Curated annotation (Swiss-Prot), chain A:
Keywords: Acetylation, DNA-directed RNA polymerase, Nucleus, Phosphoprotein, Transcription
Primary location recorded for the protein, binned into one broad class: nucleus
Record carries keyword Lyase: no
Species, as recorded: Homo sapiens
Coiled-coil blocks: none
Function: DNA-dependent RNA polymerase catalyzes the transcription of DNA into RNA using the four ribonucleoside triphosphates as substrates. Common component of RNA polymerases I, II, and III which synthesize ribosomal RNA precursors, mRNA precursors and many functional non-coding RNAs, and small RNAs, such as 5S rRNA and tRNAs, respectively. Pol II is the central component of the basal RNA polymerase II transcription machinery. Pols are composed of mobile elements that move relative to each other.
GO cellular component: cytosol; fibrillar center; nucleoplasm; nucleus; RNA polymerase I complex; RNA polymerase II, core complex; RNA polymerase III complex
Keyword Heme: no
Residue window of the full protein shown: 51 to 126 of 127
Protein name as annotated: DNA-directed RNA polymerases I, II, and III subunit RPABC2
Compartments, record wording: Nucleus; Nucleus, Nucleolus
Swiss-Prot record, chain C:
Tissue occurrence: Expressed in the brain, in the cortex and the white matter (at protein level).
Stated family: Belongs to the RNA polymerase beta' chain family.
Superkingdom assignment: Eukaryota
Entry protein name: DNA-directed RNA polymerase III subunit RPC1
Disease: Leukodystrophy, hypomyelinating, 7, with or without oligodontia and/or hypogonadotropic hypogonadism: An autosomal recessive neurodegenerative disorder characterized by childhood onset of progressive motor decline manifest as spasticity, ataxia, tremor, and cerebellar signs, as well as mild cognitive regression. Other features may include hypodontia or oligodontia and hypogonadotropic hypogonadism. There is considerable inter- and intrafamilial variability. Wiedemann-Rautenstrauch syndrome: An autosomal recessive, neonatal progeroid disorder characterized by intrauterine growth retardation, failure to thrive, short stature, hypotonia, variable mental impairment, and a progeroid appearance. Clinical features include apparent macrocephaly, sparse hair, prominent scalp veins, entropion, greatly widened anterior fontanelles, malar hypoplasia, and generalized lipoatrophy. Death usually occurs in early childhood but survival to third decade has been reported.
Annotated stretches, region: Bridging helix: 1-40
Localization: Nucleus; Cytoplasm, Cytosol
Full protein stretch here: 845 to 1043 of 1390
Native species: Homo sapiens (Human)
UniProtKB/Swiss-Prot annotation, chain D:
Species this chain originates from: Homo sapiens
Family in the record: Belongs to the RNA polymerase beta chain family.
Extent of the signal sequence: none
Record-given protein name: DNA-directed RNA polymerase III subunit RPC2
Function statement: Catalytic core component of RNA polymerase III (Pol III), a DNA-dependent RNA polymerase which synthesizes small non-coding RNAs using the four ribonucleoside triphosphates as substrates. Synthesizes 5S rRNA, snRNAs, tRNAs and miRNAs from at least 500 distinct genomic loci. Pol III-mediated transcription cycle proceeds through transcription initiation, transcription elongation and transcription termination stages. During transcription initiation, Pol III is recruited to DNA promoters type I, II or III with the help of general transcription factors and other specific initiation factors.
From Swiss-Prot, chain E:
Gene from which the chain derives: POLR3K
Gene Ontology terms for molecular function: DNA-directed RNA polymerase activity; nucleic acid binding; zinc ion binding
One GO cellular component term noted in the UniProt record for this chain: cytosol
Protein's UniProt keywords contain Plastid: no
Subunit structure: Component of the RNA polymerase III complex consisting of 17 subunits: a ten-subunit horseshoe-shaped catalytic core composed of POLR3A/RPC1, POLR3B/RPC2, POLR1C/RPAC1, POLR1D/RPAC2, POLR3K/RPC10, POLR2E/RPABC1, POLR2F/RPABC2, POLR2H/RPABC3, POLR2K/RPABC4 and POLR2L/RPABC5; a mobile stalk composed of two subunits POLR3H/RPC8 and CRCP/RPC9, protruding from the core and functioning primarily in transcription initiation; and additional subunits homologous to general transcription factors of the RNA polymerase II machinery, POLR3C/RPC3-POLR3F/RPC6-POLR3G/RPC7 heterotrimer required for transcription initiation and POLR3D/RPC4-POLR3E/RPC5 heterodimer involved in both transcription initiation and termination.
ZnF (C4-type) ranges: 5-28
Residues the entry annotates as binding Zn(2+) 1: C5, C8, C25, C28
This protein's name: DNA-directed RNA polymerase III subunit RPC10
Species annotation: Homo sapiens
Subcellular compartments: Nucleus
Length: 76, 209, 199, 50, 54, 50, 149, 99
């Protein structure tokens, strides 16, 4: 709860890549794509819709951890 | 001579007073703001001024910590201090029951004398200082930021807030000019306040190591 | 002779650039190999690979050099205020006086979303607000503008026209920009510094 | 017949625009000749590459 | 200055004899007693007053 | 050309090409043109999905 | 006669040439001293010199005289001045981070192979940068385990 | 008001229109504006015509006269300085020799 509430570009990229890989590996879609044959485009649509079932686990340098949802974080 | 030597002595005395005030010893405002006129009234000639005895100070006491603690300052007259002078100062401090001492050398310290002073005793803490360095106060320099030795409580608060250890803080050598000016030992922490280009200040911390 | 001297100067420049290429290549290699270990953590502390902290906060404030709008400054308050006034013109709202502007600024800055912001940025905002309010006061004293809003020539209000809606929009935009221009954890700040010093 | 001017913005940085009809009428036609050499040598034994 | 022996031509050094300082060689008994004052000025170039820059 | 500098820090990869560049303002800043010849050679592994 | 004319009678032996620079600001024309020497302590200790506003270009001397923070500030200012002389500007944060990485151990350490080994610890990195075989054999002798951080 | 140039459309420093667009309305708007500029400027430039010739660099009569007068004055002053240095005493600037 102490870190920045904004979702960084690195987190955006990693989440989009992981979701695109999962979709290319026959993962279920939660946005009802309309003729999108590109897993990266599908992942971007899911990110814009705020329906990606991924939780970022931010680790502090000391060892503590904190969970942040994609729908909970702020996007740009 | 007789005009620049007295000025150097006055400036060194004022620098020592400022150093004692920064460290926390008891020093009055009159001694802090001591003018060249008063220094002349005390002694206006080089042969009349006494470097080894007339310039020594024994009233410096840590009023904030404990009035019993006493700190002494020696001003050797010879350019190079010898083992005999070091032993004389050591036995004088033993007789007077004093632990902390400073030695304001005139030109330098021989290697043997330096080693002896380093390995004198854990309880007798003697710090060497060159007059060429003391002629100018390091704290008043524009490049040198403001340093404050933090207490154990402040260090514990910092460590608890940042979830860090002692070895993880930026190191600063004990032989640093500011380190010797403040008389900080191994394990202590100093907070440094750097005035940014704006009206703000950047707070950092350094561990003596 | 003139052509020969020009050719001499040209060859001098060519050899200078040739030496510069290799010299800067070596310098950049060294700088990158030296600074490739630092990175921005989530606790706003730049640390090396071994865990040692190089800075408790990047640059003393923690702003992104790539997102720096002003000359080594986060925002240009004058430009931001002009853009806000031009983007959101409220013709159905009256102007604000010095006292009203200061009051609304103090009431809006004391909200919760402004507590997490740095103190230096809030002080700069207060200074800019005070400056613009003093300018408005001087303009109104010069042109006999009354704060009651009953002056017959309404064009005088167009000299320095400000509304609480525009004030709130300006404050929110400044806060959002200052929050988005901060150092994002995980960036190879050391490598970025090495490249920006090598180029 | 070169004309110094900007045309279609396809000559931004030191680039130039050629004429399709000029290139078709033989302008700039080049020929690249390459050589492919082969050797059929006799070894120590009484045998040869064929 | 640099003096040489008219006999052989080697360099002469200044030494002290039994009566007065004298020039003598290290390779022959030739000597030369000093009668009057002898000087060798060099006139080293003095440091000019470096004026202000700007 | 060592193992640390020549084979670990900088090494050669596949699925890459090298070609001369030419100006074309009709494309966006975030777009780049690729020739058909290099496109038919550089392939991408796509996984068959629904 | 050979070595007498080269004996110092007044001044600091380290100082070689001191000149009087003048700033002609419309408010007032002021004077300052520009010394092409390598001794800041003596220049500050000399009489009539305002030691509180004395700067030097030698980072090692600044460190040994006024401390590690003074060395950091001098490095930052010198880098900024050298970069501005060429008309190109760089954000101060880059030079600040560079100076901090150089002076986070209490001593100004360079970016060369001698100043990088004292800061870093990765045996693999030290071997890949320079002195490959030497560093590898030293690590094999010391039995130092290198992490993957 | 004003005409566009490198100071506003170039990559020199801040105050660029594309920079303001990027910092105000995101990256897509700036990219679209840059694409529109790159697609519009060439068409207008080609329809208007922009060429350079020898007449665009040839000098004028007044220019040649001024150049001749300036060269004469400079050569005269240089000869005067050379004479003052060789025969006589020349004013020596501070911090440097006569040469
Ligand atoms: Zn002889």
């Amino acid at each position: 709860r102490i870190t920045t509430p904004y979702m960084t570009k690195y987190e955006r990229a990693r989440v989009l890549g992981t979701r695109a890989l999962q979709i290319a590996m026959c993962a279920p879609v939660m946005v009802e794509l309309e003729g999108e044959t590109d897993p990266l485009l599908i992942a971007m649509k899911e990110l814009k819709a705020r329906k990606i079932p991924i939780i970022i686990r931010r680790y502090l340098p000391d060892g503590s951890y904190e969970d942040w949802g994609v729908d909970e974080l702020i996007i740009t | 001579d007789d005009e620049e030597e007295t000025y150097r002595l006055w400036k060194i005395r004022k620098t020592i007073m400022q150093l004692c005030h920064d460290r926390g010893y008891l020093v009055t405002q009159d001694e802090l703001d001591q003018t060249l006129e008063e220094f002349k009234a005390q002694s206006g000639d080089k042969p009349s001024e006494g470097r080894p005895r007339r310039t020594d100070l024994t009233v410096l006491v840590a009023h904030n910590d404990d009035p019993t603690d006493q700190m002494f300052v020696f001003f050797p007259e010879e350019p190079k201090v010898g083992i005999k002078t070091i032993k004389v100062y050591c036995q004088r401090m033993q007789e007077e029951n004093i632990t902390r001492a400073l030695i304001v050398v005139q030109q330098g310290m021989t290697p043997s004398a330096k080693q002896s002073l380093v390995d004198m005793a854990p309880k007798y803490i003697l710090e060497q200082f060159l007059q060429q360095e003391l002629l100018i106060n390091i704290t008043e320099h524009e490049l040198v930021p403001e340093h404050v030795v933090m207490t154990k409580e402040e260090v514990t608060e910092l460590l608890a807030r940042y979830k860090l250890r002692e070895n993880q803080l930026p190191r600063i050598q004990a032989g640093d000019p500011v380190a010797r000016y403040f008389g900080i030992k191994r394990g202590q922490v100093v907070k440094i306040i750097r005035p940014s280009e704006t009206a703000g200040r950047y707070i950092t911390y350094r561990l003596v190591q | 002779t003139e052509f020969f001297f020009h050719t001499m100067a040209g060859r001098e420049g060519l050899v200078d650039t040739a030496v510069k290429t290799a010299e800067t290549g070596y310098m950049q290699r060294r700088l990158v190999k030296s600074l490739e270990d630092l990175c921005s953590q989530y606790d706003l502390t730049v640390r090396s690979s071994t865990g040692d902290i190089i800075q408790f906060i990047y640059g003393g404030d923690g702003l992104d050099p790539a997102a720096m709008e002003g000359k080594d400054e986060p925002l240009e308050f004058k430009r931001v205020l002009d853009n806000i006034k031009a983007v959101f013109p409220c013709p159905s709202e009256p102007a604000l006086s010095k006292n009203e502007l200061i009051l609304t600024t103090e009431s809006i800055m004391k909200k919760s979303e402004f507590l997490c912001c740095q103190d230096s940025f809030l002080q700069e905002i207060k200074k800019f607000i005070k400056g613009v309010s003093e300018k408005i006061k001087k303009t109104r004293d010069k042109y006999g503008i009354n704060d009651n809003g009953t002056t017959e020539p309404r064009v005088l209000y167009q000299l320095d026209r400000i509304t609480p809606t525009q004030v709130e929009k300006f404050l929110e935009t400044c806060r959002d920009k200052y929050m988005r221009a901060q150092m994002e954890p995980g960036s190879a700040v050391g490598a970025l510094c090495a490249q920006s010093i090598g180029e | 017949t070169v004309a110094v001017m900007s045309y279609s913005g396809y000559d931004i940085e030191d680039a130039l625009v050629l004429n399709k009809a000029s290139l078709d009428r033989g302008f700039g036609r080049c020929l690249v000749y390459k050589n492919a050499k082969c050797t059929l040598k006799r070894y120590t034994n009484q045998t040869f590459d064929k | 200055m640099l003096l040489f022996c008219p006999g052989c031509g080697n360099g002469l050094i200044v030494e002290e004899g039994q009566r007065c300082h004298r020039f003598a060689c290290n390779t022959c008994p030739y000597v030369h007693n000093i009668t009057r004052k002898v000087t060798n000025r060099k006139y080293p170039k003095l440091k000019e007053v470096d004026d202000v820059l700007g | 050309q060592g193992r640390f500098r020549g084979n670990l820090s900088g090494k050669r990869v596949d699925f890459s090409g090298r070609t001369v560049i030419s100006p074309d303002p009709n494309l966006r800043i975030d777009e780049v043109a690729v020739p058909v010849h290099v496109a038919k050679i550089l392939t991408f592994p796509e996984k068959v999905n629904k | 006669k050979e070595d007498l004319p080269k004996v110092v009678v007044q001044g600091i032996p380290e100082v070689s040439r001191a000149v009087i620079h003048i700033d002609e600001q419309s408010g007032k024309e002021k004077y300052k001293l520009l010394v092409e020497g390598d001794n800041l302590r003596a220049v500050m200790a000399t009489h009539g010199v305002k030691g509180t506003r004395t700067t030097s270009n030698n980072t090692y001397e600044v460190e040994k005289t006024l401390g590690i923070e003074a060395a950091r500030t001098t490095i930052i200012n010198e880098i900024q001045y050298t970069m501005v002389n060429h008309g190109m500007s760089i954000d101060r944060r880059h030079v600040m981070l560079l100076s901090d990485l150089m002076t986070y151990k209490g001593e100004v350490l360079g970016i060369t192979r001698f100043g990088l080994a004292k800061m870093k610890e990765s045996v693999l990195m030290l071997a890949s940068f320079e002195k490959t075989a030497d560093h590898l054999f030293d690590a094999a002798y010391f039995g130092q385990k290198d992490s993957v951080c | 008001s004003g005409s566009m140039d490198k100071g506003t459309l170039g990559s020199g420093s801040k105050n660029n229109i594309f920079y303001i667009l990027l910092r105000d309305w995101g990256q897509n708007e700036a990219a679209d504006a840059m694409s529109r500029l790159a697609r519009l400027a060439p068409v207008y430039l080609s329809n208007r015509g922009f060429s350079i010739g020898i007449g665009d660099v040839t000098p004028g009569q007044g220019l040649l006269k001024a150049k001749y007068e300036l060269l004469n004055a400079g050569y005269k002053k240089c000869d005067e300085y050379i004479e003052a240095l060789n025969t006589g005493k020349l004013q020596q600037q501070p911090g440097c020799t006569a040469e």
